[PDB]
Amino acid sequence: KEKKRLQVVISEEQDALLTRAAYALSSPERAVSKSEVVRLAIEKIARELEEGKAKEELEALLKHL
């Protein structure tokens, strides 16, 4: 009702992108875990779909599978 266990299979390249994003977002004063990067990505995509941005890039990367 308040929390949902998300199970997603990812590639090792997406794992590497997760690590690079986690380090890029981090700083000496704030630590960023991979799960926080996932939640932040979900929130950012939700906002962009609220604004309708980068749809050419969203479908470009989705068709890039």
Q: Can you give the binding site for its own copies, defined by CB under 8 A?
A: 1-12, 14-15, 17-18, 20-21, 24-25, 30, 32, 34-49, 54-55, 57-59, 61-63, 65
Closest by CA position to 21, among listed 35, 37, 39: 37
Cβ–Cβ < 8 Å for 37, 18? yes
User: Is 1 one of the binding residues for La ion (CB under 5 A)?
Assistant: yes
Whole-number Å distance between alpha carbons of 1 and 64: 35
| Residue 28 or 62 having the CB closest to its own copies | 62
Binding interface with La ion (CB under 5 A): 1-2, 11
